[PDB]
Structure formats: C-alpha cells, structure tokens
Amino acid sequence: RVDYLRKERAALRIPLSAWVEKEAYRPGEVLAELSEPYLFRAEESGVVELKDLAEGHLIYLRQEEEVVARYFLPAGMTPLVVEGEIVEVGQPLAEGKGLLRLPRHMTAKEVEAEEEGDSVHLTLFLEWTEPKDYKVAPHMNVIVPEGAKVQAGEKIVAAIDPEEEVIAEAEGVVHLHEPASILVVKARVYPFEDDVEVTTGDRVAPGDVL
C-alpha cells in the first residue's frame, strides 16, 4: 500500500462577505461561511472531469486534451455537473449552501487570492492522500522499507520485466501489508544513522561498537 500525497492547484470564487481570510487551511478549517446559498460559476469552458474526493470535489475542465481549468469545491459545496458535461463560461458548477470546510484529508497551502469588488478568487495549492494498493507476484523484489518517504520516479518494486516494474507515482509513504510469512528472531535491534562499522555474521559482545 502506498499512501501517495497528491497535489493540485485549483480555484474557487466566493463572496468576500463569506470568505474567512487565511493563508492556509487545515483538514477541516472554515474556508467560508455563507448565509444565502451560493452558485459557484464556471470561469472557463470545456468537458468536465469530476474528481470525487472523500468529502470534497475537484472539477477538471478540458478543452481538447489541454486541461484549461482545475476547480476545487469544498465540503458543503456539492457538484451540479457530471462526468462528461460540456460547460459554458458561467454555468453554475456547484451550489454552496452553509459552512464550507476543507475535507478530512485535504490541506490548503499557499492560497493566493485576488480581491474583486464583492467576490474573491482563491487559487489553492491543495494536498491530500490517495492510497493505492499494489500486486507483488513472487518474482517481484521489494526495494523499500515499511513507512518510507519515497519520491516521484523511485523504483519501489523491481522485476525482470519493464512493464511489471513499479515506480512511485509521486511523494508517498510506502507500507508493507500481508507478508507471506512472519519471522521472529530472538535478536536485539540497534538503529543507526550514517556509516556502519561491523560486517554481517560477525561475532559481537556487550559493548562492541556497531
């Protein structure tokens, strides 16, 4: 199981009168408090990809293959459009009703925003977790430990086949689940940070440097 940290820059328009002004929102934080309901309108046109995210929503808008917009609709703002709609500049994308919070797992960082008459345009650098499970067939050698910070482009699991190969899709903590066997050693474990002094199989006594 790899708990990839997914990252996305998306936008949201909301009325000043309702926006809670911050430079960052933590999974649950009160983004905006709307009195009267708000119809969030599409600021560009294209074919709509709906991204279902725990409790929040991410709209992607594609003209041809070039994504033209990325729209973020928080909690308490539910979609109006569906996978494959064609949307025109000003079509109500979602209806925001009451209080508007970040999802259970979504952090908003570095929210840059423009102030505009009565409306606010926020562009939010978003972060959340999307755990993917992976197959490991006998002739696949794990090359990473459990609980490992791993980078975009890192061979996690190796194989004699390039198609079978596993690469870490992005920044993600790697976990080890369901071991074909557990192995219990009467040993004593001594973690280290830089260079080791002692070779494997060696004889070692109380006080012997490791």
Curated annotation (Swiss-Prot):
It comes from the Bacteria. Belongs to the RNA polymerase beta' chain family. The RNAP catalytic core consists of 2 alpha, 1 beta, 1 beta' and 1 omega subunit. When a sigma factor is associated with the core the holoenzyme is formed, which can initiate transcription. DNA-dependent RNA polymerase catalyzes the transcription of DNA into RNA using the four ribonucleoside triphosphates as substrates. This is DNA-directed RNA polymerase subunit beta'. It comes from Thermus aquaticus. The lineage of its organism: Bacteria, Thermotogati, Deinococcota, Deinococci, Thermales. The chain holds residues 212 to 421 of 1524 of the full protein.
